[PDB]
Design an enzyme around this catalytic site. Structure first.
Site, PDB file in Angstrom:
ATOM      1  N   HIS A  10       0.812  -1.209   0.000  1.00  0.00           N
ATOM      2  CA  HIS A  10       0.000   0.000   0.000  1.00  0.00           C
ATOM      3  C   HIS A  10       0.845   1.260   0.000  1.00  0.00           C
ATOM      4  CE1 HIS A  10      -3.537  -2.486   0.191  1.00  0.00           C
ATOM      5  NE2 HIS A  10      -2.884  -3.178   1.105  1.00  0.00           N
ATOM      6  N   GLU A 175       0.320 -12.159   3.930  1.00  0.00           N
ATOM      7  CA  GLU A 175      -0.706 -11.537   4.758  1.00  0.00           C
ATOM      8  C   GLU A 175      -0.436 -11.961   6.195  1.00  0.00           C
ATOM      9  OE1 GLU A 175      -3.016  -9.390   4.125  1.00  0.00           O
ATOM     10  OE2 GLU A 175      -3.370  -9.408   1.960  1.00  0.00           O
TER      11      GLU A 175
HETATM   12 ZN   LIG Z   1      -3.143  -5.206   1.661  1.00  0.00          ZN
END
Ligand SMILES: [Zn+2]
Ligand SMILES: Ic1ccccc1-c1nn[nH]n1
Length: 212
Positions: A10, A175
């Site tokens: 991000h 993740e």
């Molecule tokens: Zn993400």
């Protein structure tokens, strides 16, 4: 020596340009960037991945491993997902690792390691799968639970992530947990928890590099 590209997922800041369509590597397009998620207290994914990524960088550098980052700050617009993959390929690194955190249901927790499948080249078909498996074992060894709500035993082979599809060098996307889960968010929001994630990550990277 070894070279590793680290992608803290991000942007430091977003604008309307994140909606621009970019290639997926399988034919279609997706948005340049997703905004990312956050914990219930407001701690943003982009800062979690940045701060954890800096700890991973410090750990790799301690080993003599040269690193590169996909972005240089956590307060401004960064590159789209296709650019980050093209940048990584231009470096010809020994490994590429992208760091993310998930926004799922509150009771789901733990990590999952994403890799490109079906593979689009021989690196994706072999080395990157081995890298993903090593990383999954390392996160488990740091006492990070395998996700109980997504993937299979901490792994997720998938076709929909542009950065994985576009990679020509060993590449995985981790993740690290669910930002909406109380236990995962407590780790993410603490310097000690971010260091523990970085310790698992460096052991997975080093373990993979040592097999190549
Ligand atoms: Zn993400
Ligand atoms: I730029 C990247 C680099 C390495 C692994 C995955 C990615 C990615 N895929 N989709 N978003 N990011």
């Amino acid at each position: 020596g070894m070279v590793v590209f680290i992608d803290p997922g991000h942007n430091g800041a977003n604008d309307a340009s994140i909606g621009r369509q970019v290639p997926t590597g399988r034919g279609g397009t997706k948005n340049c960037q997703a905004s990312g998620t956050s914990t219930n207290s407001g701690y943003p994914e982009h800062t979690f991945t940045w701060e954890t990524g800096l700890r991973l960088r410090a750990a790799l550098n301690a080993l003599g491993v040269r690193t590169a980052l996909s972005r240089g700050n956590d307060n401004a617009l960064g590159p789209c997902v296709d650019e980050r993959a093209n940048m990584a390929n231009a470096l010809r690194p020994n490994a590429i690792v992208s760091l993310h955190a998930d926004g799922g249901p509150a009771s789901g927790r733990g990590f999952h390691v994403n890799y490109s499948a079906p593979p689009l080249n021989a690196i994706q078909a072999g080395p990157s799968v081995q890298f993903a498996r090593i990383m999954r074992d390392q996160l488990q060894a740091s006492g990070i639970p395998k996700a109980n709500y997504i993937g299979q035993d901490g792994l997720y082979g998938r076709s929909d992530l542009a950065g994985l599809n576009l990679a020509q060098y060993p590449s995985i996307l981790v993740e690290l947990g669910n930002m909406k889960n109380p236990a995962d968010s407590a780790l993410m929001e603490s310097a000690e928890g971010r260091q523990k994630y970085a310790n698992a990550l460096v052991r997975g990277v080093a373990g993979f590099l040592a097999t190549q």
